[PDB]
Structure formats: C-alpha cells, structure tokens
Amino acid sequence: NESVIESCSNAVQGAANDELKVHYRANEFPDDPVTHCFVRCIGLELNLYDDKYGVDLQANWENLGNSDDADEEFVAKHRACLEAKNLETIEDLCERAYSAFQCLREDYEMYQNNNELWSHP
Ligand SMILES: [N+]
Ligand SMILES: [N+]
Ligand SMILES: [N+]
Ligand SMILES: [N+]
Ligand SMILES: [N+]
Ligand SMILES: [N+]
Ligand SMILES: [N+]
Ligand SMILES: [N+]
Prior knowledge:
The protein is mainly alpha-helical. It has seven helices and two strands. It has helices at residues 2-11, 18-25, 33-45, 57-63, 72-84, 93-102, 105-114; strands spanning 49-50, 54-55. A hairpin with a 3-residue loop joins strand 1 (49-50) and strand 2 (54-55). One ammonium ion binds at residues 10, 16. This is AGAP010409-PA. Its main location: secreted.
C-alpha cells in the first residue's frame, strides 16, 4: 500500500528516489542494493517476511488475492525454491530478502497481470 511504500522509502538509505519510486509503484523491483533493502522493508512492514523465519507463505498467498488456506502445491513449490536459495548463507540481510522474494516473482506478476506458513520455521 501507499503508506508502506512512502515509509520504506524513508527508512531505506537512497530509496526516497523519484526514479526508483516510479518502479516501486509499478511493482517493478530492480536488482540493485537500494531496492534490495526496499524490498526487505516492505516485506517486514507487511509481515510477509522475516530475517529469521523467511517468507510467510500463507501471508503471501493472501497478498495474491486469496482468503483461504494456501494450496499445498504453492506452499511446497515455494518452500523448495527458498531452500534452494540457501538464504541462511547470505550475509547481507537486504540481499537475502530480495533473493527470497525472487521465488515469488512469477506469482506476483501473474496476479498483477490479472488485475502462518513460514518457510524457515
Ligand atoms: N531515504
Ligand atoms: N528519507
Ligand atoms: N531494509
Ligand atoms: N504474517
Ligand atoms: N491444497
Ligand atoms: N534457504
Ligand atoms: N500463483
Ligand atoms: N502473522
């Protein structure tokens, strides 16, 4: 939502940038250090993500336009994707969050073009 985008742009060094914020409002998140931290911030603020517990797959399922329990294959597929990214070995917390969310890119893009289950318990 608008509020979280604005607050995260202030919380993250470099993120209060006109050009970057045009991307963010368009659900476009480039692979750069500022955006890494921005994506982490949004994930934390919306409780979609946690540095320790990773991606809340149920919260993300709900953020993809659903109100029910996540499909089992959605949970399985993303648990496996996230495990394959060896997130615990990524020292930079922003890079870690950005890498984690790459697993859900296809889902968010499909949802956008149409309009707890922590991965690391
Ligand atoms: N900022
Ligand atoms: N700022
Ligand atoms: N962040
Ligand atoms: N959550
Ligand atoms: N399911
Ligand atoms: N991981
Ligand atoms: N999806
Ligand atoms: N939660």
